[PDB]
A paper describes a structure:
We have investigated the role of the LC in the structure and activity of two neutralizing cattle antibodies (B4 and B13) that bind the F protein of bovine respiratory syncytial virus (bRSV). The F protein epitopes recognised by mAbs B4 and B13 are conserved in both human (h) and bovine (b) RSV, and are a major cause of lower respiratory tract infections in young children and calves, respectively. Both B4 and B13 are potent neutralizing, fusion-inhibiting antibodies and protect mice against hRSV infection and calves against bRSV infection. B4 recognises antigenic site II (residues 255–275), whereas B13 binds to an epitope contained within antigenic site IV, V, VI (residues 417–438). Exchanging the LCs between the Fab fragments produced hybrid Fabs: B13* (B13 HC/B4 LC) and B4* (B4 HC/B13 LC).
Author numbering:
A (entry chain L): 3 to 213
B (entry chain H): 2 to 148, 152 to 205, 210 to 240
Amino acid sequence: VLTQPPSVSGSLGQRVSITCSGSSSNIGRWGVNWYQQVPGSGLRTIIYYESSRPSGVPDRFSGSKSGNTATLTISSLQAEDEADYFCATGDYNIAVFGSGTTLIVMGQPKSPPSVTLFPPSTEELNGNKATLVCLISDFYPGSVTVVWKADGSTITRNVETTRASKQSNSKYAASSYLSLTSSDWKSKGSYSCEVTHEGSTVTKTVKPSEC
Amino acid sequence: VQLQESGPSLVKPSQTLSLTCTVSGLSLSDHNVGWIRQAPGKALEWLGVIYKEGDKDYNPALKSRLSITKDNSKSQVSLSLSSVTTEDTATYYCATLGCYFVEGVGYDCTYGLQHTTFHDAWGQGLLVTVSSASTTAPKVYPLSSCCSSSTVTLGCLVSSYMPEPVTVTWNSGALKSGVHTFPAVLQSSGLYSLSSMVTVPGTQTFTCNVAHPASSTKVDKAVDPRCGKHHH
């Protein structure tokens, strides 16, 4: 297996390098290739053999090799470069890929999360179900903590919150769900979704009795 | 030129995973096609490759369970992986093995590259999950944040389905500005649920188009944007 650093960091416009170390049998003898995968899409080839790039990949990407360690260097970072990067080479009749490197771009403008708390629809209540959806978007850095409440009392059970994910504007988004029965839905006065981010909390509240 | 994977996205453990890579705008006669997979949050794993003339190479660790064939006339490459376990749950990719002559050294090859045009040549990737759970179609519900703002926010809840993935569009793909489809969460019930949201600054109708190929279901769901008229 080819050894890559698990993650590297860099700011906008700065140069970052990702190493890929192998042995004299694979990297030392044969060409090296690099691949990019943004979390939303699949794999994309960015350079091949050594420093050649396919059609449509920017001039900022370039590759080099010194002995058994190949390097992918990104000259001036941009927001779209935040992705996973994998190297690959051949031993002989065998292909071997790297462990992967997560590239994180820092220095991007901070943003508080927009929070929308949806109530359960009337069509789901007819099936004696009730799921509350708390949608979170437009926040950077991509890390939030969600805590649900009902009549000012914290709830820990039947709560499922997705990790932060990169959306279209290059900030982050997340979502949290509160699955409960339709009788549990009307049993309380108000439910709320508290979203804390960078030491600041945004809270949205919903009320069954009023609505 | 396109490479498209297809096949069941849900297979039972100990059974055989079979996928098909259909190659458009290209001739399998003079193109090497290989397979690579990516387990959830794992590095890429090479599976194997079938060369132009039908020759094959495999990953030694998986050789015993691996079979790759191809039909030039159908423009199809096949992948069989037998006795699958949960470890075999992954996103499977097919790609070309483009080879080129390096004037000074010799021949070398790159996965995901076309041999002469040097264009990108990756498949879209197909997530297949090794699980004993059965295929559950989603129940889709409208989301309304009414319970009078400047930017009304509505959406669709795609609830309690198995297996991943579902694909959500709005108004047959016409509405793309202001939309965001969130990744799915896995709940206590053992099923997946996700939501898609539309923020718009109305004068139009909003229907979301949910599709779940595993259950061959496709639901169009109209979402009522209006507030004080419906409730009163």
